[PDB]
Every structure is written in structure tokens, then in C-alpha cells.
Amino acid sequence: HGNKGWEAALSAIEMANLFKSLRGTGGSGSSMEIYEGKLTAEGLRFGIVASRFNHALVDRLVEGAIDSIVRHGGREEDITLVRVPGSWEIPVAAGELARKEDIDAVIAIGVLIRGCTPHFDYIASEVSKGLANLSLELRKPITFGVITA
Amino acid sequence: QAIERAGTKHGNKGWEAALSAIEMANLFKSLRGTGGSGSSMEIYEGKLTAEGLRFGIVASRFNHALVDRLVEGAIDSIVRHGGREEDITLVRVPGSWEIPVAAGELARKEDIDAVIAIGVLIRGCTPHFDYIASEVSKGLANLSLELRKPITFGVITA
Amino acid sequence: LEQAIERAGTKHGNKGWEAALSAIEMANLFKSLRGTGGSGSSMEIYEGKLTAEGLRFGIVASRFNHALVDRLVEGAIDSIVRHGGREEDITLVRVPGSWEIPVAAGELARKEDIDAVIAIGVLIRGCTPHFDYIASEVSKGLANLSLELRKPITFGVITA
Amino acid sequence: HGNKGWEAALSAIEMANLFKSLRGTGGSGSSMEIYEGKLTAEGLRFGIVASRFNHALVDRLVEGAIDSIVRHGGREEDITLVRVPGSWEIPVAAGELARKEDIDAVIAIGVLIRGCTPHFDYIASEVSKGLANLSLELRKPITFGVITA
Amino acid sequence: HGNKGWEAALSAIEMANLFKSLRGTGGSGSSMEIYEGKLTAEGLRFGIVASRFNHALVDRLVEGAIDSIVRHGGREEDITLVRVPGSWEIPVAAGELARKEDIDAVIAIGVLIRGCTPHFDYIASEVSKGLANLSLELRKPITFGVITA
Amino acid sequence: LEQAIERAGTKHGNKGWEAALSAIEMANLFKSLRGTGGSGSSMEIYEGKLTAEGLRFGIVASRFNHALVDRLVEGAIDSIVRHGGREEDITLVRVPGSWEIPVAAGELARKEDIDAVIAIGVLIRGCTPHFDYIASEVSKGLANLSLELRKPITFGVITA
Amino acid sequence: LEQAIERAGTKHGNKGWEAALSAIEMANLFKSLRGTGGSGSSMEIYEGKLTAEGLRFGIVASRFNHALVDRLVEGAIDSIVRHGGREEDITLVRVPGSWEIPVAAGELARKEDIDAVIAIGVLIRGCTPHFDYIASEVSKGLANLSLELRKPITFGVITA
Amino acid sequence: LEQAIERAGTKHGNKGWEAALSAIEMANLFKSLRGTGGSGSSMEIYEGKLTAEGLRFGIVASRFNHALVDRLVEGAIDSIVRHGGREEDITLVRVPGSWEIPVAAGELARKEDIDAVIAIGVLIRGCTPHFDYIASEVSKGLANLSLELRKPITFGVITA
């Protein structure tokens, strides 16, 4: 309820529903159209990509993600979980899941080293950059559940 | 020469980088395969058996002492996990700036399953933003996503 | 849902994982040592590969505090399988407590099939500046058995 | 139920059954073999070696040992009880019982003096050492029911 | 705890362990050998054959069978459930499961029509006969969880 | 005192006693049948002695209503011992219920060591003018096994 | 474990099962009626097959007492799948209560894709010798829609 | 099972044990004193052996609080037997209470067969700073009898 894994799952559910409504034909008129997503996960397929580094924390994050999906009406049969050695290769694995036509949304979970950098970090900047570019190119929601130690 | 061989190289960044490449290569080979029947949550993870896989390594020549221990660390990781020394292609480049372009050429071959990039970076004795280091990370990340083939990052700071 | 909660955990670093790797490395090392020698002309180096195909293993685990011990055993099995081993070639033996580990391990090590043994357990107290008799005997027994039978035995206990 | 004599008896029963199963031929295959011992004492012969020193406590320990064996289906006819002056000579007496072909397990019961030693005790270290070596050499379970005052 | 499905599962577990011990080599001697099976299901594979006729009752019976196996240390992953139209064809389906080398025991569950027969019933007599003959020929335990309405 | 109360009872007539004698007689009878023939010149008569020295037996007993079954088993053991048998040469197998007797008996009868098998158990109800399926199958199974393996099997069940 | 407890149940006889079969039969019957006629020379008989391959279905279900309704819906889906249908060709619509079934069903029946509609729900009370207005309207609405659009609509409600 | 529970106890230190040893030592001491003297030339030392073969003993025990007294008597018998005595040569006398011990002991000590007497009993109260008349008389009586008859009498009472 209070971990970033829970929050990341909710965002994925809402975005998946929102996309489903947008492709529908527009209304007749006579008012301002408003589009929004509901929080029911029934009938949706999800994928999760998680890193093993600093495993003490991620298991709690992956825990929340699976719990949230089921609690909101999702069927545990529809979750695909992929594990990778470190955070450097989350984007490449996420891309393989996102290209499957049977996946509606993807959730990325990981942990990054301390953020007391002098000015910049060269590994953290690539994970966020890659996921963002991937979402726009494939036109499919990808959620960022990464946290900083 | 025997003094050089006696040193241990388990655990250096060459070792970890190669180990990640082996896992990712097996993981992708599983994903492309047929999906499971169902009836449960379906988990994927890469095995650590390296037999039958082809690897490529790109290493710079700057600081010839540090690099060699890293390259030898990568090779022994592949061999000790079942790989054959006949299935490794090694490419050497003048400096860290031209690692991405060489890594691109290797990655486009159909006979390569993963690529490992090794090098060292010069650390100025005051913390400014390095315009060379950022370009290596940016270039390697783009290549992997575009070519859909895992590339591992094995550089260190002096 | 609890089945996925427990199955979603990872077991990559616990002492069961490292104990398994040492057994894999030592088992392969012995095959090379008692094989044919080298051609000479240079210093000869021996080291064990991490390929676990065709090797037979045995695991002895105590039952005290089974919540933690169960996770160590799962870690050991995962290490063997992920390195190419077959779950068909693992024998598991459970014993009441730590005092019984050396005698059970002695039975398994005398079989011709097995190539290495892994001992897993949790010791009592331990965090006191005093000599503990149960802890000393278990360490002594495993060490003596390995030297007598000339077969590697790995020591994967912890304190709590 | 709560004394070390009760616990020592249970361990002896379980180890005796476990050894009986191990000597059996291995299975066909197709799964991971798992070996364990059951808690039925029927048809098993036991021996007990107890010391007389500080007799106020040991009688309760020997009490538990005999009670546990009978409660779990053991026949009182199959218990052999041997008494010795002190703890120093438990190992030598235990060795004589363990070499009999009609004994399946041996239980050793005794009490040791206060454990507030400076660094080491020279009598306690020999009882545990001797019993452990004896078990491995003879390949027969020997249980340690000794306690510290 | 009180339904025939629960009882049938326990019998299958005990018989599977008993067979495992018998194939082991005999003891040295010096006493009467006694063989028995323990009630731990860990590492055992089971198969269940159930009929659909009068489904109101069998679901409770199949319920007990699966519950008993799990409660006694069995892994739900190792249960194979097969459903058949009626009781007449339980034996033929049970035979297909029993011939698999990955199955340790088979449980048959079904319901038979009222037992106020004049002298004999021609369908009930064949189910019991077939299962009994099948067990002896294949040398594998098959349990009878059938009940009479 | 209860140990002597139970030990002071006698077990000379219960169905366990007669079942054991039949096994002893049949086991000795078969040795003579498949031995050398007689000299002829007169009608040849075969009959089994009641000496139980050097014979191996196996007993299969169900666990339902163990109060009565335990006394039948003790009767069978007493008969063998009192006729010269050794308790070392008896194998005892326990099964959950009556339905499992024939399959267990089949396992024991296939061993080369054993010379006869004794089946003991208590059936359910029985005192009704109706055909019982469990009772019929147990009788059928034991009869078929004996004829197939050519080894005597004795039938010592009762009704209650 | 509850997932297998619910998954181990069977759904072969509930009203959802029969409602699905009627839709399958009627949908196939209409294809033959509006096809080419027979050769004559004998009485012509029309009847619908039970092959559900290539047919599109729609299901409207109320939400009152979802414990029972959920089981009726699962029964309907099982019937279609077990007769050769594809779960890809099923549309499911949920409505707050029984009063809203006819209007929702009207929307689905006007699509050119669908071949039959199945209505599922649970009515209130019902077990009283009185005329109920909600029950009468729901039955009336479905009957009128079927005749107007010339498309079969099946009626799978129950009382409780 | 209670027979082994009581039989498994030990009786090595209770006052019955020490009382028996004193009687054994004194009985042997008297035989040496009234025997032939030494050769002189050095200081002569007399002391009694602990060999109890060929000696006859008598035991007088009160019946109050028989739970404790019974254990003291068993301790005395064990001491005599374990030092080489025969249970055939022990006479046991039971009396109602402590007041009757001296008179009964006087009867046994006058027999020519017996060599020493052991008195066992439990006194009442005792844990009060007051002079008790029963306690004083019992001690006085035993002391006087020993000096008059010149035969050792041991005093093995306790307070509770």
C-alpha cells in the first residue's frame, strides 16, 4: 500500500485502460470530451522486469506489484516475470516483452546506488532514458518503479 | 611469464561483465521459444551454461596494464562455464572513444549472441562532467535497443 | 497467492548458494588431479570448472529452525540446476539436529555414486565468547571424514 | 515432554529408522530422492548409559528417556540400562554397548559442573569428544543428552 | 477430515511409502522385521480419476482428496486430475494413469446409485472388479474412494 | 500390572492359530510333492508334517479395529514358535485397510525367501443378506495370486 | 489452495450450460433456414447442429448476487469452448441489475458480428403468488427484441 | 510402567546408605579388637574393613510416613548387598512409631546371631527451638542398649 511497487502497478493498470478508451470513436458532441482510465485489471496481461542486484529490497517491490494486480481484479495467470542480472540491462529485456502482442503494459522494478553524485551518474541516466524512448516508439505504457538507495 | 598466469582474476569487472552476457544470451533464447501452456505465473531466468554460444569482446588499448587483466578475466569466465575458446572474437581499438562504433560492427553479425565492452577511463583530479565517458554509455545503450541484442558494460575509472 | 509470494523470492546469495559452488568446483578439480599429467615444459596449474553436468551430489540438512534452513536448501538446489545439473542426481537427507550431521554425512560419502557432499544447518547461540562443544564437534567430524575418505565435503552452516 | 531426556530419546528413534532406510537400494529415478526417519520405536533395541553424580537431576532425565521410548510404541523389554560412577567414564561404557549387534542406538545421559569456566574445562571436553569419535568409527547413532548445571 | 475423499488420500500416501521400503534390501537379522508406511507425502506424484455423474457430491470428495495431500506435505504441482463422464469408464482411465512411470499412486472417486438392489447390480460390480485386477497386474496401489448414494 | 494381565492371556484357538497351522502344513506338503517320487508297488499318500524349522513366513495384517487384530497376529506368531519356528524368520507387513491386503500380499509372495503367506484382517458389517464388494474382491485377489505364483496363501479373516 | 478448490468444481449442468447450447443450436438453425432449399420429393426437416466453430456470441449478466451469477457465466463459457468455440469470439457485458438487461442486450444484438445473445441473471423473491413488475418487463423486453431483429436471444435467469 | 520408574531411581546417598556402612565397619572392627593382639614394636592401629560377607544384620524401621522410610530401608539393603552381603542374612522388623524403636531393637540385639543393628525412622516436627521428649528418649534408649550389650547400634533417623 505504501511501497513504490504498489504505486507502479496502479499506474500501469490505469494507463492500460485509458489507451483502450482512446482508440474508440469520438462522441457526438454537445460537451467537452473527458478521457480517463478505471482501476479494474480484469482481462489485462502484464509483464514485470526486475533486477537481482541488492535483492533484499526488490523482493518487497515485486511483492507489492503482484499483490496490487491481484487485489484489483487481476488474474495471476496473466503475469509474466523476467529477471535480469543488473539495472543496466532492464531496457533491453523490457523491449522484448513490449513487442509481444499479448502484453498490455510493462512494469520495470530496480534499485540504483546512492544519489550523492558529484554532478551526474552514467548508469542511472541510461535506464530512464531507454525506457522513455521505448514507450514512445512502441506506443505502449511502460511504468518506472525504480528507486534510489 | 608464469608469474603473470599465477595471479587470480576471479571477480574483476571482466568476470562480472562476461557472466551477465552468458545469462542474457540464454534468457533471450528462451523468450523467442514457444510460450508455456499456462495455468500459473510464468517466470524466466537465464541459465549459466555457456556451451554453444558465440561471444565478441571489444577492448581499448589505453592503460595496457589494467585492460589485460580485465580481458583475461572475461575469457576465463566463458571457459570455466563451459564455453570453447574457438567461439570468441576479440577486437582491439586505440581508445575508449571508438568502442561504440566497433561494437556496432560486431553486433550486426548473425554469428554473435552477445558483445562485451571493456575499457578504462581517465579521471581528472577534480569532478567535472566528462564529455567522452557519457558518449560511450549513450552509444552502447542505443545499439542494444536498436539491434535487439544484449551488450554488457565493463568499464572502470582509473 | 502465498505460493507466488514465496516463489517470487530469489535465492542467489545465501550460504546455500556458495556451498554448492565450492562442491561443484572441488568435484571437477579432483577429476583432473587424478587424471593424466601434463606435457611439462612449463608450470602446471590446476583449477576446477563450474560445469555440473553428470555429477552426483548429496545434501544433509538439520531440522532446527526450518524456516531459515528451508531457504538455504533451496539455494543449494538452484545453484546446481542453474549450472547444468539435473535434479535427478541430488540426494537429500534430513536429521533432527546439528549433533547428527557428521554421522549422516559419513553414510552418504561412502557410496560410490556421490562425488561431493554439502552440509547445511543452523547453530545455537554462537554469539558468546565461550567454547561451544556441539559447534566444535560438528566442525571436527566433517573435517576428519573428508580427509579419511578423500572426498570433498562443504561446510555451509550459519549462526543465529 | 520438556526435559532433555525426552528430546534425546526422540533423536535416537529417528536416527535408527533413518539408517534402516539408507541401506535400502536406491529408487528408479525420475525425481529427487528424499530420506527421513519416522517416529515409531516398534522393534528397536536401545541402550542407556547414565552417571550417578548429582543424582537428583539425572533420575528425571532417565525418567523421560524411558517414558518417551514406551510412549512412541517401544517395548520396555528392549531397554538396557547401564550406570557408571561419573561422567568421565561414560564413553568407555557406551563403547561396550555400541559394539553389541543387538543394539540399534545408544543414549548418554549426564550432568556437568557449572559452565562459568575461565576459558576451558578439561573433563567436559573429553566426554563430547569421545562420544562423537565413537559414533563415526562404529557407524551407529549415539545421542548426547548431557546438560550443564 | 470426515469424508471418504480424505480417507482415500491417506491410504494412497501410506501405501506409496510402504512400497518404497519393501524394495529395499532386508535387514541383517536378530529380530522380526516389521514394515510400515509413514504419512508424509513429500516428493510423491498422485493421480485422481473422478466421475461427473451426481456432481453435487463428488466435488466435496475431490475437495477432500486434494486438501489431504497438501496438508500432509504434498506439493499441489504433482496432482494430475482426470474427469470422465460416468462410473462405467473409471477403470479404463485409471489404467492409462497407472502405466505412467511418473505416478506413484492413483485415487478413484465416484458415486453409485442406491444399493437397495434385488440381489445384484451389474455396473457397480465391474468398477470394483476392474480396479482390483488392475492394481495386481501393474503392481501399484490404487485406492477405492467410491461411495453408494 | 497391565503388562501381566495381557501377557497372562492365552491365544491358542483364535483364527490366527489355525491360519498359521495351515501354512505350516501346506509349506511342508509342497516340498514333498516336487521332490522325488516313491517306489510304487502301492497307493502313494502325501501329507504335510507340522515341523516349522527352517521355514520362512510372511504376515499381512490390516489396521482396522487393532484391538482384535493385534490378538490374531499374536496367535499366529505363537503357533509358529511353538512348533519349532524361529521368530527371526517372520516378516510382518501392516496395511491401512482390507482393500489393500491382496496387493501387499502379492509383493511378499514374489520373494524367493518366503515359503507361505498368512493374511489376517477384520471385515466390515458382513452380517447382512447382501453382496459386499470389498469382501468379494479381497477373497478373489488372494485366490488368484496363489494359483498364479504356485505358493500357498492362507485366509484368516473374520467378520464383526 | 483456494484457486484449485474453485477450479476443481464442475459447471456442466447449471442454467448457464443449457442457455449456451440453445444459442448454439438456434444460431446454426438460422443459417440453414435462410440458405438454399432442398430437392423436395420428401418431407423436409430442419434442425441445428451443435458445432460452435466460427460463431460469435455475446453475454449480458447482471451483478446482483455475484457469487451465483459468476458460476452461471463460467458455465456458459465452458459450453461454448467445449463444443469447438473460441474464447476470442465472446463478448461479455455487465450491468447493475436485472432491470437493465433488455436495454444492454438490444445494443449487442444490433451489431452485425454477433449471431446470438445469452442473458443471465438472478431475480428477486419470485416465490410469492403475486405479479412482479420487474420480472415481467425483463421477459417482455427480450421477447420483443428477438422478434424485431430476427436474431435468437436465450433466457437463462433463475429465481432465489 | 511405574515399576521401572521406581526401579530406575538410585539410592546411593540417603541416610540409609551411610547407616549401613557404619554398621559394616563397626562389626568388622569388633572382631579384630577381641582377637589376638599384635607383635608390638610399633604403634598399633585398628580399623574396620568394608567387606560384608558372612555378617548378619537386623533393621528396625518405623511406619510413619512410609513413603520416605521405604526409600531409606531400600538404601540400607543396597549398601549391604553391594559390599558382598547376602540378602539371606538380613532381618527386618516394622514398628508402629518412633516411640517403639528402642524396645524392638533391644529384642534383636540380644540374639547371638546378629552382629549389628540399624535403626531407621522419621521424627515429627523437630524444627523448633524446644526440647522434644520423644526424640530425646529414642536417642537415649539406643545409646544405653549399645553400651549394655556391647554390640554396635547405628542411628539413621531424620527430621521432617
Numbering used by the authors:
A (entry chain L), D (entry chain B), E (entry chain PA): 14 to 162
B (entry chain K): 5 to 162
C (entry chain C), F (entry chain QA), G (entry chain BA), H (entry chain JC): 3 to 162
Please quote the paper that reports this structure:
As such, we found that a circularly permuted variant of a cage-forming enzyme, Aquifex aeolicus lumazine synthase, cpAaLS, assembles into a variety of hollow spherical and cylindrical structures in response to changes in ionic strength. Cryogenic electron microscopy revealed that these structures are composed entirely of pentameric subunits, and the dramatic cage-to-tube transformation is attributed to the moderately hindered 3-fold symmetry interaction and the imparted torsion angle of the building blocks, where both mechanisms are mediated by an α-helix domain that is untethered from the native position by circular permutation. While the wild-type protein, AaLS-wt, self-assembles into a ∼ 16 nm dodecahedral structure composed of 60 identical monomers,35 the negatively supercharged variants AaLS-neg and AaLS-13 adopt expanded 360- and 720-mer assemblies, respectively, constructed entirely from pentameric capsomers. Moreover, a circularly permuted variant of AaLS, cpAaLS(119), forms not only ∼24 nm and ∼28 nm expanded spherical cages, but also straight ∼24 nm-wide tubes of variable length. We previously designed two circularly permuted variants of AaLS and confirmed that their morphologies depend on the positions of the newly generated N- and C-termini. The native terminal amino acids were connected via an octapeptide linker using genetic fusion and new sequence termini were introduced either between residues 84 and 85 or 119 and 120, yielding cpAaLS(84) or cpAaLS(119), respectively.
The unique triple helix is not the only tubular structure formed by cpAaLS(119). In the cryo-EM micrographs, short and bent caterpillar-like objects, referred to as “twisted tubes” were also observed albeit at a very low frequency (left). However, introduction of C37S and A85C mutations into cpAaLS(119) to give cpAaLS(119, C37S, A85C) and a modified assembly protocol surreptitiously resulted in enrichment of the twisted tubular structure and allowed subsequent cryo-EM analysis (right). Since the twisted tubular assemblies were heterogeneous, we divided particle images into 3 classes and determined the structures individually. All three distinct twisted tube structures are composed of two compacted helical threads with 0-, 18-, and 28-Å gaps between them. This spring-like arrangement rationalizes the bending tendency. We also realized that one of the four pentamer interactions in the twisted tube has an acute bending angle (P0-P4 interaction). A possible disulfide bridge between two of the introduced cysteine residues at position 85 seems to support the unusual interaction mode, enhancing formation of the twisted tube.
